[PDB]
Amino acid sequence: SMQEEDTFRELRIFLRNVTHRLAIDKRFRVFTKPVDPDEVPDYRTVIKEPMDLSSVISKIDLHKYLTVKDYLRDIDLICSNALEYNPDRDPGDRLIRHRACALRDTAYAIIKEELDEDFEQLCEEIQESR
Numbered sequence: 001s002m003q004e005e006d007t008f009r010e011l012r013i014f015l016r017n018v019t020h021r022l023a024i025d026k027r028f029r030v031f032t033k034p035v036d037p038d039e040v041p042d043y044r045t046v047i048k049e050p051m052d053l054s055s056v057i058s059k060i061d062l063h064k065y066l067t068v069k070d071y072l073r074d075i076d077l078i079c080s081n082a083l084e085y086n087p088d089r090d091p092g093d094r095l096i097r098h099r100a101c102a103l104r105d106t107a108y109a110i111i112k113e114e115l116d117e118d119f120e121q122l123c124e125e126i127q128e129s130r
């Protein structure tokens with residue numbers, strides 16, 4: 001229905017605003033663009049499904065996310081990719097792990113304060129109906 005398309009358009013407006021608030025933070029600059037295979041040729045041999053905040057914006061605009069749950073699985077993949085690629089005790093690895101955990105905690109905290117639980121339940125019911 002038109003009302004169902006209006007529900008998904010509101011979900012996209014909400015997700016683009018959360019994603020842009022993450023992408024302007026200093027702590028998260030390293031997560032804003034894909035890894036340049038020239039600067040890091042090893043990356044795509046270790047990390048099988050790369051993800052970044054620019055790609056998240058592209059996926060919102062392509063109508064890939066019908067629920068906040070499917071958006072948060074891509075925020076989780078940004079975080080887990082950083083933890084797996086940078087696992088050592090050295091300070092550069094520890095700094096990107098701390099930033100990756102802060103990106104995931106920040107996204108979940110914005111969604112906990114600003115997403116109505118009944119709005120997400122409606123999206124999940126339209127998705128399960130299709």
Ligand SMILES: CC[C@]1(C(=O)NCc2ccccc2)CCN(C)CCN1
Nearest residue numbers: 019020023024025029032053054057
């Ligand atoms: C220099 C580019 C910049 C940016 O806005 N890119 C757009 C963007 C928007 C949403 C998701 C990923 C990327 C400047 C803003 N910030 C300070 C730092 C991030 N990088």
